Structure formats: structure tokens, C-alpha cells
Design a protein around this ligand. Structure first.
Ligand code: CL
Length: 64
């Protein structure tokens, strides 16, 4: 388990404005919770806590 910015194809984050959207997204993917931090390694993106190891996450590289 780990905390991280969840990703969609291909190596892209889920952009957001509200924590509620991210919490729903993260928990539906097996995480404990989720939020929409404004600043961070990836701005305005969903951040999940206690996410299952098999869920795709954002890694170094360009979203495509
Ligand atoms: Cl996903």
C-alpha cells in the first residue's frame, strides 16, 4: 500500500477542483481516502491514501 496521485491512460492524472470528487474516485479504487491538493508534485490532481499496489499511479514522464 502507498499514497499517490492516481493515473489514467497514459500516465495522466485526474484533474480536480474538489476533494469530494477525488475521495469518491479513490475509494472506488480501494483507497482509504482521497483529496484534491492544489499544490504538489502534480497540481490540482487527485491524491489517494492507502491505495492498492495494483492501481496505476502517475510516474515520471509526459501524459499521453
Ligand atoms: Cl485509473
Amino acid at each position: 500500500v502507498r499514497d499517490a496521485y492516481i493515473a489514467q491512460n497514459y500516465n495522466c492524472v485526474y484533474h480536480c477542483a474538489r476533494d469530494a470528487y477525488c475521495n469518491e474516485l479513490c475509494t472506488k479504487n480501494g483507497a482509504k481516502s482521497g483529496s484534491c491538493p492544489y499544490l504538489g508534485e502534480h497540481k490540482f490532481a487527485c491524491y489517494c491514501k492507502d491505495l492498492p499496489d495494483n492501481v496505476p499511479i502517475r510516474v515520471p514522464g509526459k501524459c499521453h
